């Protein structure tokens, strides 16, 4: 299981989020399905694909990302996330297994997904 995930994660491109304010904290049902489709096509392991999507919305994000005011205050810390690009989308995955340096209020197992309106580019 570890290698499945490790190889999948390493195969993803490192993402550079240039506009943290462009985050979509409440993606609708269609956008959520779309990001899952992208994860599935990138070879995301079935053992975690559903958990990541659940964690692509506020209601499921860790307290460090829960509210808009908090997100505004914690912007400086987001620069330190080790983020991987979801192929073909303005979205990234933040895996717990490579973000231990962030607080437990900044990430959760197995990881989380952040979708943006724009500003996500390759490093």
Swiss-Prot record:
UniProt keyword Ubl conjugation, yes or no: yes
Alphabetical GO biological process terms: autophagy; extrinsic apoptotic signaling pathway; negative regulation of cell migration; negative regulation of cell population proliferation; negative regulation of mitophagy; positive regulation of protein catabolic process; positive regulation of reactive oxygen species metabolic process; proteasomal protein catabolic process
Please state the gene responsible for encoding this protein.
Rnf41
Molecular function via GO: erythropoietin receptor binding; identical protein binding; interleukin-3 receptor binding; protein domain specific binding; receptor tyrosine kinase binding; small GTPase binding; ubiquitin protein ligase activity; ubiquitin-protein transferase activity
User: One GO cellular component from the entry?
Assistant: endoplasmic reticulum tubular network
Which modifications occur after translation, per UniProt?
A: Autoubiquitinated. Autoubiquitination leads to proteasomal degradation. Deubiquitinated by USP8 to get stabilized which induces apoptosis.
Function of the molecule: Acts as E3 ubiquitin-protein ligase and regulates the degradation of target proteins. Polyubiquitinates MYD88. Negatively regulates MYD88-dependent production of pro-inflammatory cytokines. Can promote TRIF-dependent production of type I interferon and inhibits infection with vesicular stomatitis virus. Also promotes activation of TBK1 and IRF3. Involved in the ubiquitination of erythropoietin (EPO) and interleukin-3 (IL-3) receptors.
Keywords linked to the UniProt accession: Apoptosis, Autophagy, Metal-binding, Transferase, Ubl conjugation, Ubl conjugation pathway, Zinc, Zinc-finger
Whether Secreted counts among this entry's keywords is: no
Please report the name of this protein according to its UniProt entry. Answer: E3 ubiquitin-protein ligase NRDP1
List S-S links within the chain. Answer: none
- Its domain of life reads Eukaryota
The subunit field of the Swiss-Prot or TrEMBL record says:
Interacts with USP8, ERBB3, PRKN and BIRC6. Interacts with CSF2RB, EPOR, IL3RA, MYD88 and TBK1. Interacts with Clec16a.
